[PDB]
Amino acid sequence: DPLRSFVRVLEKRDGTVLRLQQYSSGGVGCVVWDAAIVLSKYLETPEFSGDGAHALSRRSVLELGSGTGAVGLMAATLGADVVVTDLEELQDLLKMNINMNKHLVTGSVQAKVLKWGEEIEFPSPPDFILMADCIYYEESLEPLLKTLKDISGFETCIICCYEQRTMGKNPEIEKKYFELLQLDFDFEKIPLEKHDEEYRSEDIHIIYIRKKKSKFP
Amino acid sequence: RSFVRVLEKRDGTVLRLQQYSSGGVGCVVWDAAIVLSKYLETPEFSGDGAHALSRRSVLELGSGTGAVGLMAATLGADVVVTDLEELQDLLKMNINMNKHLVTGSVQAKVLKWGEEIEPSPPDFILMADCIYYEESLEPLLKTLKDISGFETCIICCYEQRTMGKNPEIEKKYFELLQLDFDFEKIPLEKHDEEYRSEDIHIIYIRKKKSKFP
Amino acid sequence: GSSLEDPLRSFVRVLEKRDGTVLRLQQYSSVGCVVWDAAIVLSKYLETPEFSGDGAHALSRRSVLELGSGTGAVGLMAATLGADVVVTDLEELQDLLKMNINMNKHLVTGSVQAKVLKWGEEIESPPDFILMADCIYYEESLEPLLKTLKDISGFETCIICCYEQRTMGKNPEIEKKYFELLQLDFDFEKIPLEKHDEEYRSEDIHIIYIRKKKSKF
Numbered sequence: 235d236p237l238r239s240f241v242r243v244l245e246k247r248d249g250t251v252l253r254l255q256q257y258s259s260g261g262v263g264c265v266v267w268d269a270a271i272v273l274s275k276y277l278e279t280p281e282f283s284g285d286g287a288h289a290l291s292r293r294s295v296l297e298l299g300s301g302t303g304a305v306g307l308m309a310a311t312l313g314a315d316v317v318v319t320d321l322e323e324l325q326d327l328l329k330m331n332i333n334m335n336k337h338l339v340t341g342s343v344q345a346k347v348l349k350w351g352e353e354i355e356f357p358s359p360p361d362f363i364l365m366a367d368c369i370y371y372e373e374s375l376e377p378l379l380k381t382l383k384d385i386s387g388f389e390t391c392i393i394c395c396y397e398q399r400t401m402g403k404n405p406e407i408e409k410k411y412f413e414l415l416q417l418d419f420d421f422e423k424i425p426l427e428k429h430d431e432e433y434r435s436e437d438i439h440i441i442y443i444r445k446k447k448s449k450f451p
Numbered sequence: 452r453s454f455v456r457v458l459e460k461r462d463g464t465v466l467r468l469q470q471y472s473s474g475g476v477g478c479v480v481w482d483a484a485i486v487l488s489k490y491l492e493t494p495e496f497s498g499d500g501a502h503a504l505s506r507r508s509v510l511e512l513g514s515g516t517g518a519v520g521l522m523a524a525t526l527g528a529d530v531v532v533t534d535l536e537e538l539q540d541l542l543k544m545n546i547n548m549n550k551h552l553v554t555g556s557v558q559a560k561v562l563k564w565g566e567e568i569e570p571s572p573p574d575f576i577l578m579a580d581c582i583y584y585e586e587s588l589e590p591l592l593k594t595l596k597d598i599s600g601f602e603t604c605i606i607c608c609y610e611q612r613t614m615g616k617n618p619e620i621e622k623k624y625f626e627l628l629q630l631d632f633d634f635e636k637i638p639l640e641k642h643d644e645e646y647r648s649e650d651i652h653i654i655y656i657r658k659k660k661s662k663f664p
Numbered sequence: 665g666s667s668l669e670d671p672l673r674s675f676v677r678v679l680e681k682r683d684g685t686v687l688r689l690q691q692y693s694s695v696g697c698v699v700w701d702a703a704i705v706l707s708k709y710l711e712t713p714e715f716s717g718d719g720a721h722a723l724s725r726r727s728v729l730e731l732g733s734g735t736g737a738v739g740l741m742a743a744t745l746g747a748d749v750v751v752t753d754l755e756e757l758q759d760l761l762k763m764n765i766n767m768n769k770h771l772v773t774g775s776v777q778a779k780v781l782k783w784g785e786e787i788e789s790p791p792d793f794i795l796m797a798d799c800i801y802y803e804e805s806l807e808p809l810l811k812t813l814k815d816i817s818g819f820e821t822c823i824i825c826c827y828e829q830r831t832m833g834k835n836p837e838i839e840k841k842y843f844e845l846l847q848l849d850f851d852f853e854k855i856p857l858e859k860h861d862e863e864y865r866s867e868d869i870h871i872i873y874i875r876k877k878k879s880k881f
């Protein structure tokens with residue numbers, strides 16, 4: 235197959251390997267971003283995993299802006315019931331990558347369309363929402379934030395990973411994301427030292443986010 | 452101590468269920484709750500790996516002392532035990548008495564059958580000896596319909612009684628149940644070897660999924 | 665009595681018409697009969713533009729006989745489209761049929777009444793239409809049903825049979841036999857799935873147009 239050379243492999247701690255196609259269909263290319271690799275590998279760290287059953291085992295996980303589905307697929311191999319979401323245009327790629335990794339899934343995974351800011355069907359709030367490199371343009375602001383607010387419950391653990399970009403308007407977009415995020419959410423950056431020892435970077439950040447509860451309507 | 456029913460777990464720890472609280476109401480641990488609680492610990496129900504209930508959402512209806520829901524919480528479930536307003540103090544007392552064994556979570560709520568529900572469908576709904584009077588019919592069934600989703604596993608354990616109105620109630624229950632739900636009796640051979648009776652049945656119940664709900 | 669003011673309210677099945685108005689079908693009388701998925705498919709098929717046709721509705725001012733009516737869903741839908749309907753079933757279902765007529769009489773633009781018709785018995789002029797939903801499931805659905813169908817239908821009767829294909833148990837054998845007997849006195853054709861209501865359809869639910877044969881001798 236000519237497309238086999240466009241597969242990106244991501245090794246799991248247990249020696250198995252996730253294989254992510256980055257092009258399909260008559261459609262679109264999507265890279266496996268470095269931020270997705272960092273987040274994926276973070277999910278396999280002993281400290282995130284915990285003792286006994288992995289932290290994600292039997293938990294509901296929604297990924298926003300999944301792209302190749304890398305992160306959500308990692309979560310599915312760790313026992314989560316995952317929904318990977320993105321634009322209509324990425325659905326074929328997501329489904330291909332589910333089919334390439336079917337044997338490694340220990341929980342469940344399915345692909346759905348979720349365009350940020352649009353009305354939701356996903357009524358019950360997930361245990362986790364995962365995002366990798368979703369903070370880079372206008373939609374990453376108000377529409378992404380609306381989706382996060384509408385979907386998350388007060389117990390939802392939201393984990394956001396992104397690579398800091400210094401080029402152009404990106405520093406102002408990043409600042410604004412976090413300035414607006416704090417209006418409806420509390421957040422904290424985790425230390426680099428909690429990331430996977432190899433798959434980490436000083437310019438790639440993992441942020442824990444939780445919905446704020448106001449006592450007044 | 453005076454009114455405690457002790458229920459031993461397979462792992463050798465013990466659930467302690469107060470059957471009365473000061474100024475409040477009495478509620479016995481019924482035989483059906485014992486049968487159902489022990490059934491949850493059977494090897495076939497528990498399954499491989501983590502127990503079938505671990506990290507699963509469980510709602511109990513007509514919890515009384517909270518016996519069955521507390522058993523589930525000790526098996527790793529996130530449990531809500533429900534009953535009438537009048538049983539809330541007893542439920543909270545029994546949560547406190549057994550919280551050192553809870554590996555999931557447990558909380559008490561009021562849920563009077565047939566009333567408007569205040570959201571996500573649970574993985575399991577458990578009922579022990581809830582089939583015995585008028586409210587066990589349309590109101591209970593309405594609650595079951597309102598709360599359950601197509602993937603909810605409903606387990607209903609009851610003691611068959613020949614006395615009084617009970618045969619008519621049991622009969623009408625299953626007639627009404629058939630409309631919106633599929634159900635099957637679990638053979639007696641699958642109950643705990645000791646904690647079982649030919650007169651105590653365990654029914655698995657599942658909501659029928661129309662293609663056009 | 666019950667704590668509930670109207671204890672059987674939650675056993676009413678609601679079916680929305682194309683114009684938004686709702687049909688209400690009680691499913692418990694004292695004896696229960698649910699609204700089967702086939703009844704919903706066939707009911708919504710009767711409302712499709714192609715079936716409805718141009719001008720006045722195809723059923724408008726036409727005689728319709730329903731066999732094995734149950735709740736009366738399909739016959740009631742036809743009555744809301746202008747047909748003069750008789751819904752029929754066993755004696756034990758008459759109260760339910762009449763209850764459901766009363767609950768929907770305000771939407772009736774033709775007419776509807778309930779009668780006993782137990783299959784394979786002696787009949788009391790041929791209708792323009794005969795409708796059947798999920799009537800092929802057991803021993804009597806064969807010789808007695810088909811005998812009634814032949815006895816009542818005329819050469820101009822449009823017989824429409826809708827059913828959900830069941831694969832468990834003795835069902836495929838019952839289905840086989842239904843069609844082995846049907847071919848003897850009737851011609852029939854399955855209508856394409858694409859002619860069914862776009863929302864209210866399924867690959868496993870079939871609509872069959874049936875017509876009484878005329879031998880030359």
Ligand SMILES: C[S@@+](CC[C@H](N)C(=O)[O-])C[C@H]1O[C@@H](n2cnc3c(N)ncnc32)[C@H](O)[C@@H]1O
Nearest residue numbers: 266267270299300301320321349350366367373
């Ligand atoms: C930079 S990528 C990250 C992909 C993947 N998470 C990774 O880290 O490898 C951004 C992703 O967000 C998706 N996306 C962008 N705008 C969106 C919107 N308004 N609604 C939904 N998804 C969107 C894109 O299609 C793309 O797959």
Ligand SMILES: C[S@@+](CC[C@H](N)C(=O)[O-])C[C@H]1O[C@@H](n2cnc3c(N)ncnc32)[C@H](O)[C@@H]1O
Nearest residue numbers: 480481484513514515534535563564579580586
């Ligand atoms: C016979 S007991 C069974 C108690 C417990 N499950 C056991 O087996 O030990 C019936 C329980 O149902 C509760 N109950 C009865 N009617 C109820 C209603 N209408 N709504 C909610 N709970 C009710 C009672 O308060 C009581 O705790």
Ligand SMILES: C[S@@+](CC[C@H](N)C(=O)[O-])C[C@H]1O[C@@H](n2cnc3c(N)ncnc32)[C@H](O)[C@@H]1O
Nearest residue numbers: 699700703732733734754781782783797798804
């Ligand atoms: C599965 S139901 C379908 C009901 C309804 N048409 C629907 O689709 O929801 C079968 C119906 O056929 C009726 N029936 C079965 N045997 C019959 C017979 N020998 N004569 C008349 N009706 C019969 C039953 O009473 C029942 O109402």
